RNA sequence: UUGGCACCUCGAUGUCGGCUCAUCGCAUCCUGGGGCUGUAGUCGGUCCCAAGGGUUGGGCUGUUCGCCCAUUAAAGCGGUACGCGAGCUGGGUUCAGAACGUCGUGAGACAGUUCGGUCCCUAUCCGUCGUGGGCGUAGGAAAUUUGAGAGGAGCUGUCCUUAGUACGAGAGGACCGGGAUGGACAUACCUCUGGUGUACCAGUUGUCGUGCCAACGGCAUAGCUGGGUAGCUAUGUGUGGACGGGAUAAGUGCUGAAAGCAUCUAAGCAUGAAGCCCCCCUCAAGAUGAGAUUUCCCAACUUCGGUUAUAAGAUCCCUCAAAGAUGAUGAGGUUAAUAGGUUCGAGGUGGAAGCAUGGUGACAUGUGGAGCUGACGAAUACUAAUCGAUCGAAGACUUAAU
């Protein structure tokens, strides 16, 4: 349940530290996003000397949310935050590290460098 | 009861293997996942926030902190995917829904054992 | 191409082949009895009356639908069966494979047999245009005085009327609904029950018409 | 919110059909036979309901 | 349940007053809805008087009023005393239905339906 | 659109824009079907048929227009008192206050700008959405019903495979055909996650009270806080728009002359669009053209004509919801489990009161998953649904076949 004007923390080392969403990608009239989905974004806060700086427009993946996801077995997974990881073509990051935990749905989403770098999948 | 027919239909889906636990206590959950290759079994060691529901619709959610990030993994109690449930402590708790832990992290999230 | 009547009891869970959770709906179909076998010769269309929920017999001073009335008791005697509470027809079903007084069972259907359930929806009362038609609420601040009302109605002098299909407040209640392409999970015969995957219409204690799907 | 036309006697009377009140839920009291009463209610006179004074 | 032209707390107090007045008087003239709601209250109280424990006195004091009735021995007594000492001893074989209602007829002022409610 | 004329309105036709609600046209924005190509292929240009569905969120501005950010299959053009102010707002223009520039001797003025500035109405008729009573449908009733008709839905991407194929120097890269999975939308529902949950559970403050301790109660937004049953719900759970048929549109063809040939047409035949009539879903016999089937009920007096209460049946009246503004619909009405209570439970809260024990004490422990528990499941006539009352047929004539 991630929309326009949501600020998401950033779970990589690309330089971005807080990020604001613009449009959710996937189709027309798409109101919200959720884990595994891609978003356009902008950087409202960046770490000094970061690769990705303030006011740069950029895509990203939603990695973890509070409005978590349901699985077919009835198991749910939620979090205590909302987080992004910043990407380009080829569904992989322009950073090199990932912070905190990550969900499994990115496997189905073919975000495999992310899953491999994530210290804990859940 | 719930209903003389509901119960008699959904009896077979139950599980009597499992222990008696309460919200407060640190337990493990040997989940039987199916990763895209094969079946592995990863464990989710955390404290139980809550249990609700009656019958096959019974649930329990567990909370672990991985790397400062709070995780909240909900389950149906009667899954076939839960191969095993181990129990470590029996925490002392004056409530049944420990939602006050979601705002607390560190020394304040400590549950006292009996 | 078959048919069976029941009662919505409620909803439960059940676990599939791979630990897959399944939201399911319980439909009790006991005392199902064919009563009249309509024919193209006499009625002009081939069909099958079906009974449900055996009820009590004639009483001289009866005062409810509990105690069956004398027309109905005769209608069922013609089938050599008990009087019935709910009757409905089934045109899609074949004629030859049913005779009169024959008792239908849940065991006709099978796991995986796909269906469409038809039932009378739950009763919401007099409701407004939002609740009833999904309209939008006007703004709740900024000096508004239009929050939940239906907005405009027509245009003006040209079209100095209100078209018939306009949407206004009214009774949101019990409209007949058919849900399609639902799957039958499991069947219980001691209890004479059918487990149906999904969210079938109407309330508890409520009639349900289960029948095989016309589209496949 | 203001009528343009008066309401004729004809329309007035066509509308004042269903405004009437009905005969109440009246019955006899068998303690006194006459002195009709309301059904499922006590008799004011006999103080009775199923034989017993009240 | 039912709401009686009163908000929640006014309803609670009206119900306690009706219960207590019934316990005192053994019959009262009221409206049918208030009767139909206070019968539940009363009957649960009689059940507590039959269970007869201290905790039951303590739970019935949460619902009764502190009133003083003069007895026919010219004696001072409370509602709760009367209840647990007299009323629960009357009904020791009766399993519920500690109260009846008699629809009387329509009141003049408000067209309300008056009833009589007593604990036979 | 800019305007013209000044025909309706000056004993009032409310005036830009946005909002809510939609509706229509097609000169079609996407999707559909086709022809020509300076169409290799992907993509395109241009025109023809086509109005079924869909046709975005924000920044700036009172703004429409417009520029921009980011998407989308596409981000359509227009009308409807530049649609809609007895449906909203009132930013803007357009009253009175004030100030700047400029004009004016001046009062004051400016399609110049600026700050501020009261948007009345209980709907009679039509109309529309829902809901009932009367009568009628040639006896009176109960149930099931076909369907003259009406309404709805009608969207579309990304991926995989065919196949890295056809094509092409390569870069690149199809149609057709099969499958999968999503966006928006509609619908039903609440087992799941969440919301509410004012007669649920517990904690707690202040003050007053039940004579005091203990325990309880009232007032403080439900005093506040933490959870929450039923129901109501979405943000959640399921489903849907599937597969097809018939006749057509632009077109594409066969045969084939008029006109020895040619020639899709004149006779004739075949094919052909998301479009039309169907298939799908709902309402429907007041369809006065009033349908059909199944079953039930079937006397006595008559002026002879007709009556009469009565049958079946349904109501009054009462207990109640799965229903509900009221009527109505439905469960039931003592040959009774309809509601209340009572006994059991589920779910919820989370360890009562009292007693004892360890402590100076605040407290903690045991008795004891304790006690409480509104709506949900079951059993139980303890209370109330008493006795009763009313309405409701005896089936016209004619013609024909029997
Ligand atoms: Mg307001
Ligand atoms: Mg209060
Ligand atoms: Mg005038
Ligand atoms: Mg006027
Ligand atoms: Mg055209
Ligand atoms: Mg206008
Ligand atoms: Mg106005
Ligand atoms: Mg306006
Ligand atoms: Mg004006
Ligand atoms: Mg001057
Ligand atoms: Mg001017
Ligand atoms: Mg001001
Ligand atoms: Mg729910
Ligand atoms: Mg529930
Ligand atoms: Mg206090
Ligand atoms: Mg005290
Ligand atoms: Mg005071
Ligand atoms: Zn009498």
The chain-level structural class of chain D is: alpha+beta
Q: How do the strands line up in the largest sheet of chain E?
A: 1-5-4
Instruction: Compute the number of structural domains of chain D.
Output: 1
What is the number of beta strands of chain E? 5
Largest inter-chain contact set: A-B, 21 and 21 residues
Bound molecules: magnesium ion, zinc ion
Subunit structure (chain C): Part of the 50S ribosomal subunit. Forms a cluster with proteins L14 and L19.
GO molecular function (chain C): rRNA binding; structural constituent of ribosome
Organism (chain C): Staphylococcus aureus (strain NCTC 8325 / PS 47)
Keywords (chain C): Ribonucleoprotein, Ribosomal protein, RNA-binding, rRNA-binding
General description of the model:
This is part of a larger assembly, with chains A (122 residues), B (114 residues), C (216 residues), D (54 residues) and E (120 residues). With 114 residues, chain B is mainly beta. Chain B has one domain (1-109). Chain B has one helix and seven strands. Chain B has a five-stranded antiparallel sheet with strand order 4-3-2-1-5, with no helix packed on it. A two-stranded antiparallel sheet of chain B has the order 6-7. Chain B is globular, with a radius of gyration of 16 Å. Chain B starts with 5 loop residues before the first helix and ends with a strand. Chain C has one domain (1-215). Helices cover 48% and strands 20% of the residues of chain E. Chain E has 120 residues and is an alpha+beta fold. In chain E, helix 1 packs across helix 2. A three-stranded antiparallel sheet of chain E has the order 1-5-4. In chain E, strands 2-3 form a two-stranded antiparallel sheet. Chain E has one domain: Ribosomal protein L17 (50s Ribosomal Protein L17, Chain: A, Alpha-Beta Complex). At the A-B interface, strand 6 of A face strand 4 of B. Strand 6 of chain A pairs antiparallel with strand 4 (70-76) of chain B. Zinc ion is lined by residues 29, 31-32, 35, 43, 45-46, 48 of chain D. Chain C binds one RNA strand of 402 nucleotides through strand 1, strand 2, strand 3, helix 1 and strand 5. It is classed as ribosome. Keywords: protein synthesis, ribosome, initiation.
Write the layout of secondary structure elements.
This is part of a larger assembly, with chains A (122 residues), B (114 residues), C (216 residues), D (54 residues) and E (120 residues).
Chain A: E1 7-10, E2 16-24, E3 38-46, E4 57-64, E5 69-70, E6 76-79, E7 83-86, H1 105-108, H2 112-117
Parallel strand pairs in A: 1-7
Antiparallel strand pairs in A: 1-2, 2-3, 3-4, 4-7, 5-6
Chain D: H1 9-15, E1 26-27, E2 37-38, E3 48-49, E4 52-53
Antiparallel strand pairs in D: 1-2, 3-4
Chain E: H1 8-25, E1 27-31, H2 32-51, H3 54-60, E2 68-70, E3 76-78, H4 79-90, E4 100-106, E5 113-118
The complex binds magnesium ion (MG) (17 copies) and zinc ion.
The site of zinc ion (ZN) has 8 residues of chain D, from loops.
Chain C binds one RNA strand of 402 nucleotides through strand 1, strand 2, strand 3, helix 1 and strand 5.
Keywords (chain C): Ribonucleoprotein, Ribosomal protein, RNA-binding, rRNA-binding
Subunit structure (chain C): Part of the 50S ribosomal subunit. Forms a cluster with proteins L14 and L19.
Protein name (chain C): Large ribosomal subunit protein uL3
